[model samples]
Target chain A: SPAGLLTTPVLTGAGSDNRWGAQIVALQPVPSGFSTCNRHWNLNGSTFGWSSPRFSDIDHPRGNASYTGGSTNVIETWYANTGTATNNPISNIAPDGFPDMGAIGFSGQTIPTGGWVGFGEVWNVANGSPYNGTVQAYELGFATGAPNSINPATTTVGTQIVAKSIYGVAIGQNQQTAGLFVLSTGIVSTSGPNATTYTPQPNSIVVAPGTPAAAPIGRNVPVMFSGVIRRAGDINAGAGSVNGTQYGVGSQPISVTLQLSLTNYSSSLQPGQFFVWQLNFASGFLEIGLNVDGYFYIGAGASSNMIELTELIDVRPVGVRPNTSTLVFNL
Target chain B: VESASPAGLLTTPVLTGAGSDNRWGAQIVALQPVPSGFSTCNRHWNLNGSTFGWSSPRFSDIDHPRGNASYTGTGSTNVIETWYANTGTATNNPISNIAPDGFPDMGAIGFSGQTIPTGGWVGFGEVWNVANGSPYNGTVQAYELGFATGAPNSINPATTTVGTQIVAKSIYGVAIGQNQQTAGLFVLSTGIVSTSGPNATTYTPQPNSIVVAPGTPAAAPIGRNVPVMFSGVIRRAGDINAGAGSVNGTQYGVGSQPISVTLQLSLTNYSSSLQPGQFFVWQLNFASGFLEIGLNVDGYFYIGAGASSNMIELTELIDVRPVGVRPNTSTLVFNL
Candidate 1:
């Protein structure tokens, strides 16, 4: 099962304050296994050692991180490549390629609150054949507008309602401690559009004006500081120390307080803001709400979208003050 | 759930007399107020003529301040001092300061710090105390402080006035008298009933009444007045009897005549033109039309009739309209 806490530290990019403290950027799950593993120039971070760096950005590959077999260039070395005939996903694409790649919004709306979805492909590798049609992987992009601006348009096959651009990066792991790895890898947009805005892309996650913490709450309301989740992992049937992540059916519970902004404030003089009267983590579902005397308006969810926490800060150059919004309620 | 918005203001009279003297006259004895369902509006106070003064500019005097509280299950009739709830303490912060203002303190008539819930349309109106033996307490005006977009600062939220006067109308059962008629002055102004003072108009119930055009049109009473009453029969208690008379003026008692049917028109349809105690025979198509009977609006036995078809007499007839036909002891006949 998953255990531990995840926290997102505030990082400045666009020139002002970013309220990100617990919001997760992305998630990947590879149910099958990996054939090839790659290493970075520094022997860490950066997928296939492109620019993702530190050998830390990439997590453990599938089917044992160590084995020797058909290997290619630096791209194969960055992410732990399985020399063991690299039975990875998207095997049709050569070890050097673009068809196997994926990207993220430089801004926040495109992936409202930051989330993604990708495919898990498992393959079979051939013996001593360049056609070694064998690959297994779980994977999941777009770059338009300003470095951190809303895209004029984006492609999606499903009901995706993302309103703004998202963080430059995406993340994923397995249902078990199979470790974490990059599915979309990094496709940076220097000035123009990104090379390929992958199809079967993650649906645009647009949360309607539901219960509090949603839009029209004046955007930047400062909720009180609560606890943080510093670590998390995917949890499946087998319970291993590797699957130690904080948010799952059986993970240790972590709580955080978020402030929501309100308008037409009454009673208390200096009416700048007020919090949703109460928030309770009753069970598998995490609840967020607001109240006035006897009435309670509530919202609840069970995914990382509702409970992903992060602490490690990644350095990147992106900036823009998240826009502010508003809402109405009695008392 | 009951809305947190003001339903209606209920005011009771403690005493009764002319509006001339505050001592000899009446005062608002008890005021019943309720907070809406969603947004909670607390802090309440009642305005009256005694302490707030009669003609003191605008009726205002917060002497009787009720603290932050909501009156839900405690019944609607909140009494003077003994019944009001304040701060949720049973008897700790009861209402006091019921004394009439010795002079002019017109700016203190209501509860402050309380506002209509967000997005609520503020409204105010007058209510007449039910005539439960206290004579006809007159009608007074109420006020509602509404919502405004982009202009939160413009609303008082306290007295709820945008620097102008708030107007109220009479309660449902009561209205401002019309023409040369007279009515009581229940609530004279934002304050209690009318009172005499230094300069301002001493608005008297005799003049400047909350007189509304009487909702009921004045009675013309042109037709002869007659008493028409009846104990009704929805279906018939008995069928018409056929006298042993012959047709063509025979000795078989007067020849047959159409059965006299009386139909009463609803209040909306009644008119003096409809004679009181009049019986008009009418045809009825119970199969396709309808027939209703009742007292004529002008206190009379009225029967309205219409609807018919081809005349026929049959032992068995299938009711195509499927109306609730009454059980009969004899053969039924009908004429179009």
Candidate 2:
């Protein structure tokens, strides 16, 4: 463990289970020389602070700079340039404990208004005592308006600690189906420094009880119905296990069979009747409706005091008949 | 005072010097010498007709108890409007004259503590009162006046009448500050009749007396200043009887000042055999001369003319006398 390591593992042997020790190297170290490298403090650099040596270089440093990649190596008094454009320090170059520190997490509407915001800290021991111990803050840019090309849930340069290990949530999006939801959650690796990846955590969903969920309703109109979601546990459950032991699920897919029915219906809605389920990831809320004709509709629901949802559209298995017992859906 | 009202003051007071009455008699006071108390009717308030008692409670009231260092027996009663405190007011405390009167006065302009006059009753000429009849009530708030902010402009609160002692008048021009000596008249009645002139005659009308002409698109009752066209003979064209003079340079009656003249030629007064009965000046003048158009008594076309000294006479002759030949026309013929 480095300087201020908070908690150490309780070492338990083959029958003699729990004990503690010194010189204890907590997590596994990274591969000695992986071609994948991030940054190395260059000794031949220029200036410091504002307007001086403004940006810290990455990938290729200036002139006779180093490109070493190791866990035990050290480089003092690195170089910087007022001109270099790369200074984003969450470099994630070397896993600082856990790849995804759970350091940052954001939960919002699937179709976010603007974007999200987060912060990153820059620790540069490469500067030396007086300046080396100095700290700087970097504002993370995560505001991606919609489901953009990459990292739909977030746009901040690197991974962050989430308040809770969320799998996904329901979000209203402008697309073919309003039942669209996200399913991106983080999972820690088994070996080396606990690394993290974006994956889906499968959970269960089932139709609520009696009442023929029908439309054309007047008084007591089906406002909303209930559903149960199970199995959405933390993805990084036991990542840092010792003695060649590891735990976690890998790139997985999820699905559910719903037997929806109209419960309490009304022009107005009752509490919990609308967006009743929280999508696993940072998705917003979920809402589904079944019409009197046995046709089903899914939408990114909206409501202040109403069981609201986007207009319905037909896709495969989009509906169920009064006689047709069930409907199957996949993520 | 009358037996029915004891709290009231007597109409008569024949004081040789001074004699005290019972029950803490207050001398017919004019603010001062009244034990520094309120409700003291001042003796100094008088009238000047025009400016007197122009303010009232509805328009003006005591704005104070205007506090000063303390109740020093005198202070200024503040107000928000104009000229109400003009003539004579107390200095706030020991607020006499006004507090007793219950109504506001025209201040220096009028005698305080009485109802203000209505219409055109001339009480004190142009200037002669510092001690006249207490002013009466009509104080119209400016905001309530719509536009007539001052007294003479609107005497709605008071009945309008014409008093004999009117300081002056052009009769046709509007003047102010009079009384309701005559009963049952609007504050503006006298001024209206008095305003008869050669430009515009102001007249009082019975409600709904003037309806709109049937030909207009919006046939509504005639409103103020609506343009009107007359279609009858000029009837009663002269000064408005009672020697009220003419309106807008003419004696035209019952309508707007005539800005246009139209002449009509009719045959019903002569012969009923004519087709349409009458013709316009433009219709009659559609030729080189006076075109006499009508049906002949014989029920036949008879058109002709006769040349005597300088002009010719038009007659039904089946012949054009001026042109000297009948020219073979038929049915109805016109000789111009």
Candidate 3:
């Protein structure tokens, strides 16, 4: 067992029980060659601060990067851009963690109310606090595991992480079931390192007083808040474990669940105006859009907190209203 | 102060799993200071756990205590709310409430009328929680909430009058007592509107007044050279009475300075018949002030042809903090 490795066998595939077929090297070794044809750095990537050479292995394929499929063993792929779009459908930038507020796990509801707060650190490393940093969605596009189209709980190697975004209204906060940011709560491969995936539990992003920079509109506008609520807990439980690759909500690196009974407001709000919605828990996870195909409002169940991530839907420039008062909802 | 009640408090344990996250968090809407008051700073609560928590950041802390809530989401809809004393309040702590198995329209339950142990008079009685079909027996953590000013006589006591009653309107968390059984265990007067005065006869309770139009405050954050004001009718347009800053902050009765510009006004809840627009205004000024480019400061205000309890009407006055540092403003209903 290597030092600093809480659970390494499943990560480096150091023994027969391992399956993915990649080797875990150091950060510096990336961008350089090695005697072992397949050994590569994990990139523990910003998403997971486990490795070095923080950037994607994509640039240094052989050196720092993991082989797409061929010679690369367990620690298959190097790092790459996360799957999150720049907006809430995948971005929820409004609630994304702050660059300086590293890894601080904060409640989503606290974002706007000026309640509890923390900076990203070992206490919140990887800018983990869900609502702390500037980035909303993040996916581990591994270079080693199997590939398949995903959902809010999608798990695969050579893919990406999508989360809180607000490109459209449906693309809001707490992706408890967001598609774009597939928060891997379990390992997709026996030889873990690069094959690991994640599933965010709501608190992926957070919103503040200045959050939700006005929702910019595109050409077309969708009426319905169409989306799916993937699994509320871990999808890969007892049956999904490989050797010692832990699976389930409890075993994952981080855990967060955002609870919301959405129907509180008296009426539906249009694009511009703001309204109050009643919530109990101080805070939890939040994602905006379900970025499976086009755009949806569910998040990648990766984080935890009740943050306001997106506008819920994307209405066209000429199609939105500025202020729809509760008067309209007096009923 | 409410943290301490007779049945509990002073040294009572925080009831386990009574609020949000199942922790000691509370949601208080209009947190006002009750100075020059009683031995116990007890507060009245209509809904204690309908939604099961205070919907505010404050009172959620471990130290500060707040009310709880309860409600069933299975209903097609639900609302979370609260009602507080705008001005006057109980002289001492009046903690316990009474409910009868026969009461149906009671939304929430708590007795207001009090009895003095010695000899004075106390008034005011109303239903705290209003609902449909309340059939449970009552119990208290320690003992029952005695007469108002009845015992613990350090503070003054009043008489329990006949008209004391609570009118439940469209309140928050529609059904509180129905879902929360903890409160069901404790009920006060088995009969309604019961409070004993020192003599038991003369002293009476004040009829729960239905406040139709609540007064809102004027004065908002303003930047240098900005205009701030409160707007309202001098009299009921029809009522020849005048309106002004009654004794600076006296928000009730009669009229005073009829201003062409007032910062605050009352937007009575939407009524069945469209009430006529009887309006007036108050003006505001900022002579000693500056502005800061940073966020959070640079006082702002709102101005409109009419009044909205919900919408804030702020005009930027100055970057400088007023005498105290808090921005000036008026109070409105709907806990806005």
Q: For this target, which candidate reaches the highest DockQ against the unseen true structure? A: 3
Query: Roughly what TM-score does model 2 have, to 2 decimal places?
Result: 0.12
lDDT of 3 by residue, A1-331 (tens): 0111112221111211111111211101011111100111111111211111111011110111211222211111112233322332213221122110112111331111111111000101121121111111122322222222222211222233321110011011222211111111112211111112221112212222222211112311111111111111111122222322221111111100000011112133323432222111223322121111111122112212222212222111111133222111110
lDDT (tens digit, per residue) of candidate 2 on B156-261: 2211111101111111101112233211100100011111112322221111222111121221111111111111111110111111122333211121101000
Candidate 3, CAPRI quality class derived from DockQ: incorrect
Tens digits of per-residue lDDT for model 1 on B184-280?
Answer: 1111112222111111111111111111111211111112211111111010001011111212110110000000111011001223222333322
True contacts recovered per prediction = 0.00, 0.00, 0.00
Model 2, stretches more than 4 Å misplaced? A1-32, A36-166, A172-331, B1-336
How should the candidates be ordered by TM-score, best one leading?
Answer: 3, 1, 2
Kindly indicate the candidate among 1 and 3 with the higher TM-score: 3
lDDT digits (tens) for residues A1-331 of candidate 1: 0000111222111110111111222221111111111111100111221111110112122321111222310001112222211323312111211111223333322222122221111111111111111111111222223222323223212211111111111111111112222222221122211112211122321111111121122222111111112110110101122323221110001111101111122232112222222111223222222222111112211211222213223322111111221211111
Whole-model lDDT, model 3: 0.17
